[PDB]
Scaffold this motif. Structure first.
Motif, mmCIF file in Angstrom:
data_model
loop_
_atom_site.group_PDB
_atom_site.id
_atom_site.type_symbol
_atom_site.label_atom_id
_atom_site.label_comp_id
_atom_site.label_asym_id
_atom_site.label_seq_id
_atom_site.Cartn_x
_atom_site.Cartn_y
_atom_site.Cartn_z
ATOM 1 N N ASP A 1 0.868 -1.190 0.000
ATOM 2 C CA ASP A 1 0.000 0.000 0.000
ATOM 3 C C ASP A 1 0.907 1.243 0.000
ATOM 4 O OD1 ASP A 1 -1.756 1.904 -0.081
ATOM 5 O OD2 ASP A 1 -2.858 1.257 1.750
ATOM 6 N N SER A 2 1.224 1.775 -1.159
ATOM 7 C CA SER A 2 2.164 2.907 -1.279
ATOM 8 C C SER A 2 1.563 4.196 -0.734
ATOM 9 C CB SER A 2 2.600 3.154 -2.715
ATOM 10 O OG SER A 2 1.485 3.506 -3.524
ATOM 11 N N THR A 3 0.258 4.227 -0.525
ATOM 12 C CA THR A 3 -0.458 5.478 -0.172
ATOM 13 C C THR A 3 -0.474 5.688 1.336
ATOM 14 O OG1 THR A 3 -2.685 4.458 0.036
ATOM 15 C CG2 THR A 3 -1.989 5.200 -2.116
ATOM 16 N N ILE A 4 -0.161 4.706 2.156
ATOM 17 C CA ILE A 4 -0.263 4.819 3.644
ATOM 18 C C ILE A 4 1.153 4.789 4.194
ATOM 19 C CG2 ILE A 4 -0.994 3.710 5.729
ATOM 20 C CD1 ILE A 4 -3.587 2.939 4.214
ATOM 21 N N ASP A 5 1.546 5.884 4.843
ATOM 22 C CA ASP A 5 2.915 6.065 5.355
ATOM 23 C C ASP A 5 3.003 5.647 6.821
ATOM 24 O OD1 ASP A 5 3.640 7.221 2.859
ATOM 25 O OD2 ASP A 5 3.026 9.235 3.556
ATOM 26 N N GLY A 6 1.916 5.197 7.381
ATOM 27 C CA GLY A 6 1.877 4.776 8.785
ATOM 28 C C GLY A 6 0.500 4.972 9.359
ATOM 29 N N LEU A 7 0.364 4.742 10.676
ATOM 30 C CA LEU A 7 -0.918 4.807 11.355
ATOM 31 C C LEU A 7 -0.823 5.768 12.517
ATOM 32 C CD1 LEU A 7 -1.518 2.225 9.706
ATOM 33 C CD2 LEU A 7 -2.805 1.423 11.679
ATOM 34 N N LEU A 8 -1.909 6.433 12.805
ATOM 35 C CA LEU A 8 -2.007 7.274 14.013
ATOM 36 C C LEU A 8 -3.173 6.761 14.822
ATOM 37 C CD1 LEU A 8 -1.514 11.062 14.284
ATOM 38 C CD2 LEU A 8 -3.429 9.945 15.450
ATOM 39 N N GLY A 9 -2.842 6.085 15.920
ATOM 40 C CA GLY A 9 -3.871 5.427 16.716
ATOM 41 C C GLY A 9 -4.610 6.380 17.640
ATOM 42 N N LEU A 10 -5.916 6.190 17.749
ATOM 43 C CA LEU A 10 -6.824 7.075 18.506
ATOM 44 C C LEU A 10 -7.719 6.261 19.438
ATOM 45 C CD1 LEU A 10 -7.688 9.531 15.635
ATOM 46 C CD2 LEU A 10 -6.304 10.054 17.683
ATOM 47 N N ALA A 11 -7.391 5.002 19.681
ATOM 48 C CA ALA A 11 -8.037 4.249 20.782
ATOM 49 C C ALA A 11 -7.377 4.653 22.108
ATOM 50 C CB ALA A 11 -7.961 2.795 20.520
ATOM 51 N N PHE A 12 -7.699 3.948 23.179
ATOM 52 C CA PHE A 12 -7.193 4.364 24.500
ATOM 53 C C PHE A 12 -5.746 3.927 24.633
ATOM 54 C CE2 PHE A 12 -10.838 6.403 25.992
ATOM 55 C CZ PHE A 12 -11.854 5.877 25.239
ATOM 56 N N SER A 13 -4.980 4.723 25.391
ATOM 57 C CA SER A 13 -3.513 4.526 25.466
ATOM 58 C C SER A 13 -3.140 3.205 26.173
ATOM 59 C CB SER A 13 -2.825 5.699 26.101
ATOM 60 O OG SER A 13 -2.946 6.886 25.318
ATOM 61 N N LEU B 1 -3.881 0.410 25.121
ATOM 62 C CA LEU B 1 -3.501 -0.544 24.049
ATOM 63 C C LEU B 1 -2.162 -0.254 23.404
ATOM 64 C CD1 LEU B 1 -6.873 -1.050 22.150
ATOM 65 C CD2 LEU B 1 -5.859 -2.504 23.946
ATOM 66 N N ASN B 2 -1.474 0.810 23.774
ATOM 67 C CA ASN B 2 -0.220 1.175 23.108
ATOM 68 C C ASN B 2 0.796 0.052 23.333
ATOM 69 O OD1 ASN B 2 2.667 2.531 23.631
ATOM 70 N ND2 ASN B 2 1.613 3.423 21.847
ATOM 71 N N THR B 3 1.554 -0.338 22.340
ATOM 72 C CA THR B 3 2.425 -1.521 22.441
ATOM 73 C C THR B 3 3.850 -1.164 22.844
ATOM 74 O OG1 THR B 3 3.286 -1.700 20.160
ATOM 75 C CG2 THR B 3 1.056 -2.614 20.618
ATOM 76 N N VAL B 4 4.194 0.084 23.080
ATOM 77 C CA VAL B 4 5.606 0.386 23.424
ATOM 78 C C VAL B 4 6.005 -0.256 24.749
ATOM 79 C CG1 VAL B 4 7.340 2.175 23.823
ATOM 80 C CG2 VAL B 4 5.561 2.475 22.026
ATOM 81 N N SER B 5 7.166 -0.871 24.732
ATOM 82 C CA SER B 5 7.780 -1.569 25.878
ATOM 83 C C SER B 5 9.174 -1.012 26.057
ATOM 84 C CB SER B 5 7.783 -3.054 25.600
ATOM 85 O OG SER B 5 8.371 -3.749 26.685
ATOM 86 N N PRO B 6 9.665 -0.864 27.327
ATOM 87 C CA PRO B 6 8.984 -1.232 28.565
ATOM 88 C C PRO B 6 8.115 -0.149 29.183
ATOM 89 C CG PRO B 6 11.211 -0.553 29.043
ATOM 90 C CD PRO B 6 11.062 -0.483 27.537
ATOM 91 N N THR B 7 8.031 1.001 28.535
ATOM 92 C CA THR B 7 7.268 2.164 29.044
ATOM 93 C C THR B 7 6.174 2.443 28.009
ATOM 94 O OG1 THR B 7 9.314 3.013 30.073
ATOM 95 C CG2 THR B 7 7.393 4.497 29.909
ATOM 96 N N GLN B 8 4.942 2.155 28.333
ATOM 97 C CA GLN B 8 3.816 2.383 27.411
ATOM 98 C C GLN B 8 3.742 3.883 27.157
ATOM 99 O OE1 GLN B 8 -0.284 1.486 28.866
ATOM 100 N NE2 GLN B 8 -0.234 0.019 27.124
ATOM 101 N N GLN B 9 3.383 4.233 25.922
ATOM 102 C CA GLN B 9 3.283 5.637 25.476
ATOM 103 C C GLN B 9 1.839 6.067 25.239
ATOM 104 O OE1 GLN B 9 6.242 7.652 25.200
ATOM 105 N NE2 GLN B 9 6.859 5.869 26.458
ATOM 106 N N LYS B 10 1.626 7.356 25.272
ATOM 107 C CA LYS B 10 0.308 7.974 25.039
ATOM 108 C C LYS B 10 0.037 8.230 23.565
ATOM 109 N N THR B 11 -1.233 8.151 23.196
ATOM 110 C CA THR B 11 -1.674 8.587 21.865
ATOM 111 C C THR B 11 -1.507 10.079 21.678
ATOM 112 O OG1 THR B 11 -3.960 8.961 22.399
ATOM 113 C CG2 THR B 11 -3.376 6.690 21.808
ATOM 114 N N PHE B 12 -1.571 10.495 20.438
ATOM 115 C CA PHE B 12 -1.566 11.925 20.074
ATOM 116 C C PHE B 12 -2.734 12.611 20.766
ATOM 117 C CE2 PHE B 12 -3.204 15.262 17.277
ATOM 118 C CZ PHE B 12 -2.107 16.072 17.206
#
Ligand code: NA
Length: 330
Positions: free
Chosen positions: A119-131, A133-144
């Motif tokens: 999919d050449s048109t999508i450069d990434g995702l910006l998640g807007l569910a609750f933080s 679910l953020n997958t960053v380890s070992p310190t979970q990060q906040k959404t925009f």
């Protein structure tokens, strides 16, 4: 503060929508898929395995004077469609539609699955569910949104997706010109990290409304409407020649058909999805079998009010202390 950005379908079927996002200093503008069903902001980058990049715009942190490695942090995500990505993490300045967050976690992909590469048109995702679910380890990060919230005029964002046309994401305000009638608000459960709510029932075409509770999520990153098998069978029974195809992976219908509308309840209110919105076109180029936009959620373990449903409404994602969803006709 507020922000307002236009979101544009990636193709003639509205398979997804992209919204320009400024990252870094000087700005690097990437077109991201805003996803209310996930909580990672991740991008194609200068770190992405070169064979996995095919036309996407990449974020280069070394060219941003505000980028900083978030030392030791990694991320890895798997989506409902079987796609996946993973990598490391930078913090940087991120702006959407004039609304700026400093110190946003920007997850830089080292690896992406084939559906992302293709999919050449999508450069990434910006998640807007609750933080949560953020997958960053070992310190979970906040959404925009979670990082912006306290600065916004009102702790809300709205999705106004277009049918075969651009729409809008707004942050921090309701545009009272963007909808008709009134907004009906409904309760949200955050227990699974989603914008999870309960629809009050449905109707097929001009049929009677069936009062029934349907728990599901409001998910801008999912193309189609996924509902219980009983509801989906009732819909496609009104289309001559429609059938569930194990080979294709869902309900298909003759491309010659005129599809009925589908109505879903929001409290005592009703959102009508026109029939045209439910047509996802030929299953393969030149086929006279067309793919349906309403599909069974059986085996997915949740109902999903994806873009087919959301683009029929003006949708308010109310991130107040007790979150709620709002729906209006438009
Ligand atoms: Na498909």
């Amino acid at each position: 503060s507020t922000g307002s950005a236009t979101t544009t379908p990636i193709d003639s079927l509205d398979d997804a929508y992209i919204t320009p996002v400024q990252i870094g200093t000087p700005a690097q503008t990437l077109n991201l898929d805003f996803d209310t069903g996930s909580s990672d902001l991740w991008v194609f980058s200068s770190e992405t395995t070169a064979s996995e990049v095919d036309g996407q715009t990449i974020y280069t942190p070394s060219k941003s004077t505000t980028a900083k490695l978030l030392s030791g942090a990694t991320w890895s995500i798997s989506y409902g469609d079987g796609s996946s990505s993973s990598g490391d993490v930078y913090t940087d300045t991120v702006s959407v539609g004039g609304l700026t967050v400093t110190g946003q976690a920007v997850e830089s992909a080292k690896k992406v699955s084939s559906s992302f590469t293709e999919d050449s048109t999508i450069d990434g995702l910006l998640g807007l569910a609750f933080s949560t679910l953020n997958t960053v380890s070992p310190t979970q990060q906040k959404t925009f949104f979670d990082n912006a919230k306290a600065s916004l005029d009102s702790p809300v964002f709205t999705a106004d997706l277009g049918y075969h046309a651009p729409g809008t994401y707004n942050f921090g305000f309701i545009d009272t010109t963007a909808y008709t009638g009134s907004i009906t608000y409904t309760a949200v459960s955050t227990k699974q990290g989603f914008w999870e709510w309960t629809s009050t029932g449905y109707a097929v075409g001009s049929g009677t409304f069936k009062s029934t509770s349907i728990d599901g999520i409001a998910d801008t990153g999912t193309t189609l409407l996924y509902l219980p098998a009983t509801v989906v069978s009732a819909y496609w029974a009104q289309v001559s020649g429609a059938k569930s195809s194990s080979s294709v992976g869902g309900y298909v219908f003759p491309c010659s058909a005129t599809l009925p509308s589908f109505t879903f309840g929001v409290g005592s209110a009703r959102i009508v999805i026109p029939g045209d919105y439910i047509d996802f076109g030929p299953i393969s180029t030149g086929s006279s079998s067309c793919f349906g936009g309403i599909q069974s959620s059986a085996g997915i373990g949740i109902n999903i009010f994806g873009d087919v449903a959301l683009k029929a409404a003006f949708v308010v994602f109310n991130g107040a202390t007790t979150p709620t969803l709002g729906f209006a006709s438009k």
